[PDB]
Each structure stands twice: as C-alpha cells, then as structure tokens.
C-alpha cells in the first residue's frame, strides 16, 4: 500500500553501499557494457536510462557510457543480431536531457563505433590503446524469393541512411561523404588518427602514464 | 428481453391448432435441411404448404391464387440468394436475430388483436410488419397497409395498433 | 499499511487476490503446486470464488512433441470436485487437451473467455513401447481404454452432451471458436470489451479526421465494388448450370419408358404426386421460377452481338459416330435419333 | 495509475502468444499507452494495435513488419485438411484486428498480409498502426506521472 | 529402400553375358534423369546427350525424367545444349516435376512431349538465400531477377502464352495436372490405360469455375464439396 | 550387412527376368521406382502377350514414387498378374489392387493394410493450404482408383481409409482387393471322433 | 525435502534443520563433490558440543577414494557416531554401516537391502604403471576387509572369498552375522 | 559413356574442383597430346568454384598441350571456370547461349602464429595480382579495368561477354542469348 | 499431527517405494493417503503403508501393479546372484500387500505376474483402498 519510492545519492548515502558490481555502477550513473547486443542484454539498458530519469533531482550530470562489444556483427561476419535493435538504444539514450558522455575500452564493431561519435562533443573519451571499427552491416541467413531480397536490400539502405546521419552531425560531413569514407569497406581505425578524423576527441579523465609519473619524481 | 427464446413459449402457451402446425413445420425442415437456423423467409415456407389455414385465404384476395408454384418460387429464393449450405450437427436449433422479432410481435400483437389464442393471421400480420413479403412478390405490391385492411375486412374485427 | 508488507513479485500479488494463473504447460512439476494452491484456498474458506486463467497447450506441444501423459490432467479435474467452492474460470488465448477440460469442469454460468481464444479438444498422445512383448500391448491398449473413458466422463458432466456423440468428434482434433463453444457446451458466456474503450475510439477517428483523409474513402469504394463483382460473377454462374437442369429435363421428357412406376411400388405409398419428404431429399423446382420481378433492370448491355446459328430442327435423323445402341430404343417423333 | 506504459521491442514469436496480449489490453478498465521501440512483428503490432487509438507512439527509426502467421506439422491425410482451414482462419482473425483498428478495407489487409511487409516510420502513421511520431515530449510526462 | 538396393539387372545369352539395365537402356538411345540434380549428374545427361549425337544424327533421342527437383544452374545446362543438337528429342515426364524437372519436359521438341496420367508438373520463380553485405545484397537481388527473365521467355517459346498468365502461375506454388498442363501448353499428348479416363480433382474445381457441375448434381465424379 | 548376401541375392533376382517375374521389395523411394519402371518396359519388348507375375512385398514408401509405377502398368499391351507376399501397405496394396481382374491372387497369411497417405505441411500461410491441396489430390485419387478396382461406392472407402485399416485374405475376397488365392491342397487330416 | 522448515522461530532448509539438531542425512551417491560437504560437516560439528551423530543412508554405491575420506573423519573425531539404515546401502555405501557404533548403535528398517562386494578400480596406460596401480588396488582390496572382519566379527578368510563375489544380506542375516546391532521396530 | 567421349578426345571437367579431380584431368590432357598433337581437344567445364592452387595445374596443363583446345561453358562457371574459359586458343571459344559467367577472386582461410597470418596473407595477393595479368593477356583488356571488375560479385550475361574479350563466339547464332 | 500427502506418480523404481513404505510406519501417529490421477508401483507402497481405515482414492484414479524390472550386465556368476534379487524383491512387496488386502499369497503372484490395472470399484474389493471421496 505505501509506495516504493526510489533513492538517490543525495538521499541513499545513509544506506550503505551497494553490494553487487553492476548496481555501483548504476549509483555512479555509469553504464559499462561488456556483452555484444543480444535481446536479453538491451532490456535492462533501457531500464536502466529510465531509472537515471526517474526521479533524479538535477537531471543534468553526465551520463557515461562505456562500450566493449562487437555490436551486432561477430568477429567471423555473420549477423549474431539484426541492425534494428540499435535503433531502441538510440532513442532511448537521446532521450533523457543528460548529456552523454561516451567512452570506448577496446573494441566498437559497426554498432558501438557510430554510438561512440553520437555523444556530447567535447567529450569523447577513449583509451590510447584501442580500436575502431565501422563497416556497413550485413544481414542474417533470409530465404525467399526475388522480391524477398529486394525488401532485405531496402533494410539496409535504411541502415547506411541512418548511420551517415549520425557521422554527418559529429564529423560535420555531408551525408556522402560518410558514406565513402566510412561505410563503403571493412576498415579499422586507430587512435591518434581517429581525432583527426573527428571521432574522438581526448583521452579519458585523469590518465597518466606510470613511466612519466617516474619522471616527475 | 430474450427469456421468450425457449420453447415453453410455443407449447406451454395457449395456440391454436392452425398456428402451432405453421411453427412445427418450420422446426423440422431446418433439421432435414442440415442448417440448423430458423430464419423469417422459411417461416412463409408453412404457410403456403398448410392452403387448409385461414391465412392462406388472404393471400387468395391479394392476388396469389397459384398455390403449388409459390411454394416452390420462395425454395428457389432460398437456394441462390440466403443459400442452403449444410453445416455439420448442432443439438438446439437456433432463431435469427431477423426471425425472432417476428414470434415476438405476433405474441404481442395478439394482446392488440383481443384473441386469448395465437392464430394463422397473427403469422401473416408479423412476417408483413418485416417486410419479408414486399422482397419476395415485388411485382404484386405486398405493402403493410393493404394487408392491414384485408384481415380487418376478412375476419370482421377492428385492430389497433398504437 | 506499515504491518502488511506488500508482494514481492507478481505472481504472489494475483496469489492475494484469490486468482490462480496457469500459464505453463501441464508438466509434473506445475501439477504438485496446483494441488497446493487449490488446497490452501480451501483452508481459507469454503466459501470465497476462486478466478482461474487458462494459458496452456495441455499435457503435449502444439506440434506433436510428448512431454508427459494424459493422467496427469486427471489429478488436476479430481481437485476441482473434491473441493467445494464456487470457481470462476477464464480463458485466455490456448487451450488445447486437459485445458479445456479444467475450462468446462468449473461452475456452469461463471465459465468466460475471450472472443479470440482458441479452445481445442482431441485424443491423448501415446508414447511409444521400444519392441516389447505381445501381452503387454493389450494392458496398454486397456490404459488407453480407462483412460479415454474418463476422458469422456469428466468431458460429459462439464458440457451435458452423450458419450456416443462426444466420441466420434474426438477422433479428429476439432477446434472450438468461441462463437461456436456457446452452442457445444464449453463456455457460458463471451467477455466483452470496454465500451468506455470503444466510443472513445469510434469518435476519436471522425474528429481526427484520419478515417477520411489518408485515402479511406477511395479504398473501402473497392471493397464494396470487388464485393458487388464477385457478386455479379456467381449469380451469372448460377443461371447458366439452372439453363443446363432445365435442358437435361427438356431432354428426359422425350422419353418412352415405365422405368419410373417400378421405383413407385417399392417405396411408399402416400406421396404419389410431387410433395415434400422432410428428409435429406429436398427436390428443388426449376421451372417455377416465374418470378416477374419489375425492380431487376437490365443494364446498358446490348444483345445484338450475337450470330446467327445453323438452328438444326428437332426431327432429324441425323445420328453422331456412336457406338450402336438402338435395340429397343424407338425413334421419338420428336427425337427420330434416339 | 489510470494508464499502464509497456515498452514494445521484441522480434514476435507465436501469433497465439500475440492474441493474448491485444485481448487483456482491450478489456482492463484503465488506460493503455503502447510505445513501439525498433520493429513491431505479427506478435508485437498487435499489442501495438491492442492500445487505445489517439496514444500509439512510434520513433523515427522504428519500423513495422507484417506477415502471415507460420506453422504446419507432420500427420495424415486428412489431419492437414483440419489445420489449414485454422491457419485461414487465424489469418482471417488478424486480418479483423489490423481493419478495426486501423480502419482499413478487408480486401486490402490480405494483400499486405500475403508477403512480409516492411513499414517505416512515415507509412506507420499514413497507415494506421500508430498515432503519431514520438518524440522526447511524449515521454517526458509519462516518466513524471509515474512518480506520484 | 530403407537399409539397401540391390542391383536390379538382366543380362543373358547363349554365349555371353551382357551388361546391366542402366548400360543397356543408354545404348538404345534412352536417358534417366532420377534423383537431386546437381552438379555431378548434370555432366552425365549431357554427356550422355553428346555420346549418341556421334552414334547417329537422325535417331530420336529419348530422355526420361524423374526429379523432385535439382540446382537452378545445372539444370539450365541441360535445356540448352538438348537445344542445340541436330535430332529431335522425345520427352516422357515420369513421377513429379517441381520447377525444375517441368521445364526439361516442356524443353522437348513440338509433338513428342508425352506426359502420363499421374505425372505432377509445378512452376514457380526460383529461390535464393541473402547473403552478408549490401554490395552482394544488390548482386543477389540482380541474380534472381536475370534468373526469373530468363526462365520467363523459356515458357513464352515453347508454350506461346502470355506473359502475364506466367506472372500470375509462378508467384504462388501452383501445380499442374496434364489435363490442366495440355491447355497450357507445356505438353503435346496425353498418356493414359485401356480407356482410362477418370476425371483428377483439378478438373472438377475447375468444372466449378465455369458453372458445369454444382451441389444437387454432382454428375459421374467424385465429391469436392468436403471443403 | 555383408555383400555376399547381396551377391547371392543378386543372382536369384536375375534368374527371375527369365520367368518374366519383377520384383517390387522395400520401401517404395524415387530410386528404386525408376529401377523398377525400366524393367517392366524390357520384358514387353521379348514378348508382348506373356504376362508379368509381379512380386510385390513393400512395408511402405513415398506417395509420388508409386504413382509412376501405378500408371505405367495400365497402358503396357500385357496384364500383369500381381501377387501378395507377406505385407501390402499403402503403397503396397495400391499396386495389388491395379492388377488385371480375375488374376490378382494372394497368400492366406499375408497382411494387406490400407490408409490415407501420410506427409506434412511446412512454410507460409499459403504454403500451407497449397501443400495442403496436395495430399488431399493424392487422398480423393486414391479413393478414386479403389472405388473402380472394387466396385465398391466412394463413400464406403473413404470412411475405411481415413485410418489404418489392417486386411484378412478371407474378406479380401468379399471386398475386392484379390480375385483368388493361390494355395496347394490341404492334407487329409483325420477328425477327433 | 525442497520445502524447508523452522528451527525456532525461522525458516531454515530440512537438511539444515537437522543439522543443528545432530542428525546427518545422505540421500544421494559417494561421489567427490558430496564428500567434501560430508568431512566438512563432521568437523563443524565435532567443534561445536561433543555428543553422538547420527547418519542416515540411502547410497547406491560410490567410489572408493572419497568413501575412505568420510570413513577416517569417524575415528579421527573424539565424539561418538551411530549409523542408523533406512531405504538400501549398496557398494561402498554398506561398508560406512559398520563404519562405527560398534557398541550396540547400529539401527536398520526390516526392509533394507544390504550389499557388500570388493571395490574396484580402472586405470589405464603404461605396463610398468600398471603393476603400481595393481598394488594400490590389491592393498585396497585387504584392507577393506580387515576392517570388516574386526567390526562384524567375522573371520578375515571368510570375507575374502565370500565378498570377491556378489553378495547380498537381509536385515535377518545382518543380525547373525555382525553386521547390524538392532532393528527398528514399528515404533 | 565418358569413355566414348575419350576416343573423341572430348572430355568433362564437372563438380567442385578438388586435389584429387586435378590430375584426372591432366594425365587425360597429355596422353591425347602425344597421340595426335594435331587434333584439337574439346574441354566441357562446368564447375561452382575450386582452390586456386589445384586449379592452376588445369591451367599449365592447356598450356602444356602443343595442339589447339577448344572450350565449352555450360551450366556454371564461379571464380575457377570463367578463368579457364578466357584461357583457350582465341577463335574457338563457344559456349552455351545462357550459361552464366562469374570473374571474382579465389577464398581462403587464415590462422596460426602471428608471422605465419602475414606470409599467407600476402601469398593470396601474390595469386590475386597473378591471376589478374595473365586473364589480362587474351581479353585484350586494360589491367587497371580488368582488376576492379573481379572485385564485384556479379555474374554475367553473354551477350556482355563478347565484346569484353573473354569469349569468342556463341553457340546458337547469337539471337538466343537473354537478358 | 496427522500426516497428509498427495499420491500421483506415473513411473520410477520400486526400489525407492520401499523406502517411503517404512518410513510411514516410523510415524507414530495416523497417516491419510489420498491418491489423485495414476498410481505406479512405487505408488501404491505408499498407498498401501498407509493406515487401515483413512486411505481415499476418487472416481477417476487408477493404481497400476506390476513386478520390479531391473538391467542386468556383465559376468556370469552375479547374474544369478542378481536374479535371486528381483525374485525376493517380488517376494518383499506381495508380503507387503499381504498384510493389508487378507489375501493369499499365492494369487497376488499371480496378479503379478504381468502388469495389472484397477479403477475406482475394484480397488476397494481387492483393500488397497478404503472408500471413494
């Protein structure tokens, strides 16, 4: 009968801390994502930005986002996903008035690259160590006729319109050229030449190397 | 409301003779026809099967004399046009939402029409109030109010109507 | 509000509203908890109604695959009659074996569903023996026998019909609508939806305007003339097989026989004339069909296409590449070929 | 809490499991808001059909696929004669949800439902699944209403 | 056969053995075609096509075809070089044809297409499977159109129907009895026994298209009203 | 199992063409039907009037393989007498029951079992229905061909062939599946008094 | 045994229960993974108070190695143990019957099918290998039965010829024979 | 058989192209070259793909044999066929007016130690640039056209194949050939 | 106090029966056994352990009897040890139905012998019931 009203870090400080890993990092308003885009795993990211929007008091700490996943495309190139369902992570994390700030560990396959350039501008975090990627997506095993292929070519049509849309608006490119440059051919990309690029921006907050902390001392 | 839907109305009611026999013919004939229905243009069926009613003599002064082939052009309109189609078994023989408006006004107008009794006109005078006769003979003008002057002439009685 | 403490889940708040939920399918492991929950209730008054929802395949899968065996869905009828309470159960969606079994065997005027539910009642599944002996299929065939009989007895009390009848529809796997589980037996009565739901819908579209305006009108005109069509398309094939019935018995009145008064001494006696039989025989007329009509006009079609034909007359002799047949057959005066 | 909030993104399953959920949706006193997040299959669209008409929120990259249930299974002669009058006539059950709804010819559903059909978000409205586009407005306030 | 097929053989003589039935059948001019036909077999029927065009130029060379089906390329293989030879072919349709095997019978010369009384004939577009990237997405869409072109005017050349009537067949799975198959075009005549001639139920569907045959008069057929 | 089985087996199959005896044994498959076509049309070609005592033992088979060896018996200019060895089955009595009439002859402990042919429908909404249609094509011929073999009326078959209906060859004489029996005369065996 | 119970006045598991009320139960095989949990229980509650223990069986059979584990943590403890039979106690599962309580504190039901046979072994590889395993299995072999011949009574030639085999008791031999003290009655 | 089209120097190259259907081949090829060095040999190829390492020998081998060799293309030709195709004496190229064409590069797979990746990595670019020059040899082709249309998955037609150098003529006068 | 369980089992060894057999009779109190749907062999044990006077059974129940079946492999010699098992084991649970139906022993051997089938009548005249609920 009486409600179950959520609390937060001004109010659940009295509480003690949280025991289980994942539930620190939800307190510290932190997302790390450390599996590819399976349908059991993008439930709980969208309950967990509405959550952030709940009764949170500011509405105006950012929210960072940490990605490790292949996205929807495997290491061999088949589709373990479909190009859909990045679609619901989009429009959910968008939606909240937070800013986001997004940052990458190792690896962002064809899905997470173009959500790593989708954050606040400014403040693309990533490490000096990783890699990025960006392909156009592939589909999964469809069997049908002529014109069964012809409604599948238009999915993907669909999905190089929507991720040059997304490259236009950080690069600040037209909407072909992302679609030469980065959805044309599997390519990598590296760190240092990425920022020249416009996909990164700086490293992570507080980095230092443990060889120039020797030399200042 | 719908607690007339039972067949205590048609046996534990007092009807005569002439009536009962037009309602227990239309009963059997869904069950030998495989459609389990009863619907307003099979209740014209009895009629024009039983010529010894007093119903029957009515329809003699509005212009059907042939008696054998009227019988058989409404079994041709059922065929073509509602359709006859056999369905597999059902126990409790259904009426039609159009038909059973007509078993209702006829019980209801025979409080109107002061008889205790329901008779073979109260038959005529509800399927003509459905207008299930102006569809059937189009060409003869079976209106609603020539048959309401032709049972009053015939059986020599003023009925109202509110 | 400070001494109750609320539910922690989901199935445990439906458990405090007395509403049982049975959406797994009838394993081994979902049987022992129902002859628990309905139990417990049991012990907390004979007199309270039970709410019951039936989500299930039955003892089997939808596809044929055999995951346990019909006596289970016994157990769980032998609970609700040895209880002794009102039970309401409803329907919702599948309902396929011993779940319609447990739909029918509650209180008869409580029994509800869902216009599109989907009930179906057919025989039980046997798993296979593996290459045994000889007289342990006859055993085997006397369980299925006291099976399928109680099958038919719990089935008989929840619906009223006989066994006789019961047994021949359960040969095939019969599916039930819902429009058509009210006349068999199965259900009492259809639950509606809101209709708070439905005028708020209905008047939403005309003050929107988005039952006009996006292209509604020029499509529900082509349904109504694709269904005046293929109404026109019948009726034409209707009067052209009426034109062959009615030359086959233009054809048969030039006939000289007596093989008709052989079958009208064999059969009955009392309708000598064209009459009715109230059987499966009912013997169309065709030609009285003297209808007259003056509404039906013809439209703006013009008959003066057609040719003129050779218009060969009646007596002839004149006979096509047959094999030869005239033993007894006369000529006709108006049919010399015979 | 007079109106419930579910979020749709699934890839469907059994059309069955989909009836369900679209009949529960039309019968609770209280109001029904659906927001479609990625596609909408044949088990998804009809709870997207299943909310009341003037709250059905779709995304600019959402879409909307619609198909013909599958199904069949192995038996006699006469047992598939049985189960593919039910397959017409599950597809003929569909097709009064998707012409209630949407109010949409009876004709025309069968030819839509005859092939997978893909829908984006523009044709989702000029169709009549949805109401209107979603946007960050629209589920501002259902996150605050909540609250209370 | 569930477990084994013995070799069912004749060879017999007065001084010598002969050879075995498959051997002896392909020196009288007469060709199998049974089973899946893929790539390997689609070697042998032409091959076999090319061994007795050296034998004789004039001979009728017969083929018979039994196949549930078989690998869209392979059996193009086999239509046009059986077109490209200078002997008529004589095809006898055996079994079933499903969208494969119903082109090789109908790929026969004017006149000697010879179907049976039970022999089922289908014709569908071909299929096809998706495969990875957008660039191939667009090549696989490509190749089933130039597959769906080119076996639309192999129908238009030996049948001489309309286009659209081959539009509105191959959409669906559509099956074709001789009897429906002789109106088509696709064969010449029709095989039956010692008078046989019993009506299949595609007829009787169609006798109820045109308005022959209705409920009260069902005629000297069998019942199609159990739907 | 071993091949010296299959050798043995081989020969006495092949001494078989020389009494114009076929053999039609397992399960009737697309293979084995198109061995068994190209045999019968080799042993008109010696002699056109002898008949053809064909052997037939199957446990059952595909539907559409069976067709081509129903039709190609029937146009041949010689019958062809067909017997029953051991088990008929659907597809197996089928061929039992287009014979020629008056020489279709059977064992008195042989099985002769009749049903609906079996199969299955998967795919679309539409693939259904047409697969559908294809077995109830197979159904209504089936019943079609057997009302003529029998003489017996077609509501009659179909209420036996929708189940597995196992045969005796005493009442397979009163049915019209065989015409005779084939049997050596019993001994005399002397009563218990 | 899945729905738990109530020590006093809380929920706790069946098989808890009855541990803090010093009644051990082993429902399933001697395996590895089991033996751990069972060596681990009688040291915790050997700690606790010194009083008798009481186990209850239902083996099946096991292996060899972890049924030795759990037999020495008996005589290694300085509290007394009694065996009590109910169900079957097969393979190496009967020999922890006469594991101890040898002093009139060894109970079975009058339905209990009792099994004593030789243990066994499987190791595979080189030759020279497999002559130490043979010993290993050959000093397993005698020394099992020297235990069962000091419990039970029996003579030590007895048991080597009549366990090599398959060998099956009742509880109306078990008496006689040494192998159980007492039956349970009714009550 | 296949043995009546071996007296007639005719032989089949069908199926998928494997180690042990390669020197089938060739130790046919050379045997009708020392017979008759003077007849041609007519060559049957129908095949959905192969190594490029097997398939080189039928290469060496066409090159190997002093008389002339003729080709026909039926049924299928992906990535191994086509090349063999082109790979005859120009003038007597012929092939079936339908069949298809597909020029696209050989597959393969790559793993082990990290110098083993980059020495297979570089061999399949090393038979990627030598199947580009020599195919470029008898088309009459530019090598920078010639080694992007390889890169396309797309079969081809024909009618097209003609004029892009690959074939010569086509069996059935050229008419029956469609889009 | 008094113990009640529900009986419903299709299948398992008989083995196990004889182990819930005993340990009803262990309770010093009463025991209600009430059987719902099927009863298999190691069913019935339970249903027959029960004491006289309080075991139900419904109008649709059933309890199946048969003899312990076991798989038996390997040398010669414990095959016959082994087949003296299954033999008294049979011999254990007709002395166990003995003592609750008051019949002789030789005919319940022979209503063991293959499998056997009750329903709701015939239960309570052969006594492994009492009454029908």
């Given at each position: ?9 001004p ?10 890993l ?10 790390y994502?450390?599996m ?44 373990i ?9 989009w ?5 909240t ?29 990533s ?91 | 409301?719908?607690?007339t ?21 239309a ?50 309109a ?85 | ?36 929950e ?82 179906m ?100 005109q ?18 052209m ?64 296409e ?33 | ?18 009836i ?89 559903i ?15 409205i ?17 996150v ?5 | ?33 049974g ?58 349709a ?70 659209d ?41 169609q ?21 | ?35 068994l ?55 197996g ?101 | ?37 069972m ?49 079957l ?99 | ?9 005719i ?45 080189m ?43 298809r ?57 024909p ?19 469609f889009?």
């Amino acid at each position: 009968y009486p409600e179950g009203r959520p609390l937060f870090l001004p109010e659940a400080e009295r509480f003690g801390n949280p025991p289980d890993l994942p539930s620190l990092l939800l307190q510290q308003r932190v997302i790390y994502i450390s599996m590819p885009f399976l349908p059991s795993v993008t439930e709980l990211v969208v309950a967990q930005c509405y959550y952030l929007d709940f009764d949170d008091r500011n509405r105006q700490r950012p929210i960072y986002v940490y990605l490790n996943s292949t996205g929807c495309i495997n290491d061999k190139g088949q589709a373990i996903s479909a190009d859909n369902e990045f679609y619901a992570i989009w429009a959910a994390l968008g939606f909240t008035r937070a800013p986001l700030y997004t940052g990458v560990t190792w690896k962002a396959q064809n899905q997470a690259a173009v959500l790593l350039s989708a954050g606040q501008k400014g403040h693309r975090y990533s490490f000096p160590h990783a890699k990025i990627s960006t392909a156009p997506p592939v589909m999964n095993r469809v069997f049908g006729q002529a014109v069964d292929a012809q409604l599948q070519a238009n999915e993907l049509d669909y999905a190089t319109k929507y991720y040059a849309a997304i490259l236009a608006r950080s690069t600040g490119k037209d909407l072909e050229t992302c679609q030469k440059q980065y959805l044309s051919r599997k390519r990598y990309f590296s760190v240092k030449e990425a920022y020249e690029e416009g996909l990164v921006d700086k490293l992570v907050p507080g980095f230092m190397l443990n060889r120039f902390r020797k030399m200042q001392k | 409301a719908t607690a007339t839907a039972a067949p205590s109305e048609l046996d534990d009611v007092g009807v005569s003779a002439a009536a009962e026999s037009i309602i227990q013919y239309a009963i059997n004939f869904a069950r030998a026809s495989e459609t389990y229905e009863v619907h307003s243009w099979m209740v014209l069926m009895g009629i024009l099967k039983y010529e010894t009613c007093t119903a029957a003599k009515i329809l003699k002064s509005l212009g059907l004399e042939d008696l054998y082939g009227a019988w058989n052009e409404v079994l041709w309109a059922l065929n073509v046009c509602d359709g006859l189609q056999p369905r597999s078994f059902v126990t409790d023989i259904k009426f039609a939402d159009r038909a059973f408006k007509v078993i209702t006004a006829a019980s209801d107008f025979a409080v109107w029409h002061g008889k205790d009794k329901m008779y073979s006109e109260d038959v005529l005078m509800a399927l003509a109030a459905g207008g299930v006769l102006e569809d059937l003979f189009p060409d003869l003008n079976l209106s609603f109010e020539r048959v309401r002057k032709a049972v009053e002439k015939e059986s020599g009685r003023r009925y109202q109507l509110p | 509000d400070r001494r109750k403490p609320p539910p922690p889940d989901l199935p445990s708040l439906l458990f405090d509203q007395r509403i049982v939920y049975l959406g797994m399918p009838l394993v081994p492991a979902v049987t022992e908890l129902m002859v628990a929950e309905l139990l417990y209730l049991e012990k907390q008054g004979a007199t309270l109604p039970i709410e019951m929802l039936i989500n299930s395949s039955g003892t089997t899968r939808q596809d044929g695959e055999i995951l346990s065996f019909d006596s289970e869905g016994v157990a769980l009828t032998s609970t609700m009659g040895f209880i002794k309470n009102p039970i309401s159960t409803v329907n919702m969606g599948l309902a396929v074996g011993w779940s319609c079994v447990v739909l029918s065997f509650g209180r008869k005027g409580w029994r509800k569903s869902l216009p599109h539910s989907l009930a179906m009642i057919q025989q039980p599944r046997v798993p296979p023996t593996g290459q045994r002996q000889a007289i342990e299929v006859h055993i085997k065939w006397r369980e299925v026998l006291d099976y399928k009989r109680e099958l038919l007895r719990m089935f008989s009390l929840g619906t009223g019909l006989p066994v006789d009848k019961l047994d021949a529809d359960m040969q095939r796997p019969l599916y039930m609508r819902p429009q058509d589980a009210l006349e068999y037996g199965i259900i009492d009565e259809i639950i509606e939806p809101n209709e708070d739901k439905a005028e708020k819908a209905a008047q939403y579209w005309i003050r929107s305007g988005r039952a006009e305006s996006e292209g509604r009108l020029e499509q529900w005109q082509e349904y109504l003339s694709l269904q005046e069509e293929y109404a026109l398309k019948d009726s034409f094939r209707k009067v052209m097989t009426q034109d062959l019935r009615a030359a086959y018995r233009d054809t048969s009145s030039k006939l000289l026989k007596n093989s008709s008064r052989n079958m009208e001494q064999v059969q009955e006696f009392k309708e000598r004339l064209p009459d009715d039989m109230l059987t499966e025989n009912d013997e169309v007329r065709l030609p009285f069909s003297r209808d007259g009509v003056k509404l039906a006009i013809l439209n703006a079609e013009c008959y003066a296409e057609r040719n003129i034909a050779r218009q060969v007359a009646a007596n002839k002799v004149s006979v096509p590449d047959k094999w030869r047949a005239a033993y007894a057959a006369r000529p006709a005066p108006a049919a010399p070929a015979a | 809490s007079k109106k419930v909030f579910m979020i749709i993104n699934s890839f469907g399953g059994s059309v069955g499991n989909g009836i369900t959920v679209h009949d529960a949706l039309q019968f609770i006193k209280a109001g029904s808001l659906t927001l479609a997040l990625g596609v909408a299959a044949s088990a998804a669209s009809l709870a997207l059909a299943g909310g009341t008409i003037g709250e059905r929120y779709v995304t600019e990259g959402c879409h909307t696929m619609i198909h013909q249930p599958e199904g069949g299974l192995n038996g006699q002669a006469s047992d598939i004669w049985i189960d593919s009058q039910e397959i017409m006539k599950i597809r003929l059950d569909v097709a009064e949800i998707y012409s209630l709804s949407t109010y949409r010819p009876r004709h025309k559903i069968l030819r839509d439902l005859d092939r997978d059909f893909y829908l984006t978000a523009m044709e989702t409205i000029y169709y009549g699944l949805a109401d209107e586009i979603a946007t960050n407005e629209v589920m501002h306030s259902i996150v605050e209403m909540t609250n209370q | 056969s569930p477990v084994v097929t013995p070799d069912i053989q004749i060879g017999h003589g007065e001084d010598a053995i002969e050879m075995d039935l498959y051997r002896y059948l392909l020196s009288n001019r007469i060709i199998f075609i049974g089973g899946y036909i893929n790539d390997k077999m689609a070697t042998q029927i032409v091959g076999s096509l090319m061994a007795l065009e050296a034998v004789d130029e004039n001979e009728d060379i017969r083929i018979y075809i039994n196949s549930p089906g078989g690998q869209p390329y392979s059996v193009l293989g086999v239509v046009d070089a059986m077109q490209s030879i200078k002997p008529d072919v004589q095809t006898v349709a055996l079994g079933a044809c499903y969208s494969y095997a119903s082109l090789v019978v109908a790929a026969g010369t004017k006149g000697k297409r010879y179907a049976m009384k039970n022999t089922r004939l289908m014709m569908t577009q071909p299929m096809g499977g998706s495969q990875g990237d957008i660039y191939q997405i667009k090549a696989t869409v490509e190749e089933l159109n130039a597959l769906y072109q080119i076996f639309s005017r192999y129908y238009m050349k030996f049948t001489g129907m309309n286009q659209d009537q081959i539009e509105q067949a191959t959409c669906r799975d559509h099956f074709m009895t001789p009897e429906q198959a002789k109106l088509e075009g696709l064969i010449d005549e029709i095989i039956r026994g010692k008078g046989d001639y019993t009506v299949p139920p595609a007829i009787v569907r169609q006798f109820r298209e045109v308005g022959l045959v209705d409920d009260l008069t069902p005629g000297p057929f069998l019942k199609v009203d159990c739907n | 199992p071993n091949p010296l089985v299959i050798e043995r087996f081989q020969g006495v199959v092949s001494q078989l063409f020389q009494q114009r005896i076929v053999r039609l044994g397992g399960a009737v498959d697309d293979d084995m039907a198109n061995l068994l076509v190209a045999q019968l049309l080799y042993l008109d070609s010696v002699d056109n009037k002898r008949d053809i005592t064909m052997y037939v033992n199957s446990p059952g088979g595909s539907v559409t393989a069976g067709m081509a060896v129903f039709d190609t018996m029937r146009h041949i200019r010689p019958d062809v007498s067909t017997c029953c060895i051991g088990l008929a089955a659907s597809m197996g009595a089928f061929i039992l029951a287009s014979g020629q009439a008056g020489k279709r002859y059977s064992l008195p402990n042989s099985r002769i079992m009749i049903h609906q042919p079996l199969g299955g429908a998967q795919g679309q909404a539409t693939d259904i229905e047409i697969q559908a249609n294809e077995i109830l094509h197979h159904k209504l011929t089936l019943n079609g061909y057997l009302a003529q073999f029998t003489g017996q009326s077609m509501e009659t078959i179909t209420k036996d062939t929708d189940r597995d209906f196992f045969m005796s060859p005493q009442e397979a004489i009163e049915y019209g599946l065989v015409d005779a029996i084939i049997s050596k005369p019993q001994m005399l065996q002397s009563r218990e008094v | 045994c899945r729905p738990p119970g109530q020590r006093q006045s809380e929920w706790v598991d069946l098989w808890e229960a009855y541990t803090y009320q010093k009644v051990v139960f082993i429902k399933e095989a001697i395996t590895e993974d089991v033996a751990n949990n069972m060596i681990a229980l009688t040291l915790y509650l050997d700690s606790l108070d010194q009083k008798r223990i009481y186990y209850w069986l239902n083996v099946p059979g096991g292996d060899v190695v972890p049924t030795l584990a759990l037999y020495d943590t008996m005589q290694y403890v300085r509290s007394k143990t009694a065996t009590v039979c109910y169900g079957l106690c097969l393979g190496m599962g009967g020999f922890l019957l006469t594991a101890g309580g040898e002093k009139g504190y060894r109970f079975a039901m009058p339905h209990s099918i009792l099994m004593m046979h030789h243990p066994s072994g499987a190791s595979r590889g080189q030759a020279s290998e497999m002559h130490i395993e043979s010993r290993e299995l050959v000093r397993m072999r005698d020394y099992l039965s020297l235990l069962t011949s000091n419990a039970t009574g029996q003579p030590y030639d007895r048991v080597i010829r009549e366990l090599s085999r398959n060998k099956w008791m009742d509880p109306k031999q078990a008496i006689e024979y040494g192998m159980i003290d007492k039956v349970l009655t009714t009550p | 058989p296949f043995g009546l089209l071996l007296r007639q120097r005719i032989v089949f190259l069908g199926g998928e192209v494997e180690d042990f259907g390669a020197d089938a081949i060739i130790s046919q090829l050379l045997l009708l070259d020392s017979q008759d060095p003077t007849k041609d040999i007519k060559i049957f190829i129908n095949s959905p793909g192969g190594s490029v390492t097997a398939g080189m020998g039928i290469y060496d081998a066409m090159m190997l044999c002093r008389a002339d060799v003729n080709t026909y293309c039926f049924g299928l030709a992906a990535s191994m066929g086509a090349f063999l195709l082109g790979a005859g004496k120009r003038g007597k190229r012929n092939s079936m007016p339908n069949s298809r064409i597909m020029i696209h590069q050989p597959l393969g797979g790559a793993s082990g130690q990290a110098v083993d990746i980059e020495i297979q990595a570089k061999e399949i670019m090393y038979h990627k640039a030598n199947l580009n020059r020599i195919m470029a040899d008898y088309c009459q082709q530019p090598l920078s056209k010639i080694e992007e249309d390889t890169d396309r998955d797309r079969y081809m037609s024909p009618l097209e194949a003609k004029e892009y150098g690959l074939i010569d003529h086509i069996i059935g006068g050229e008419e029956a050939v469609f889009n």
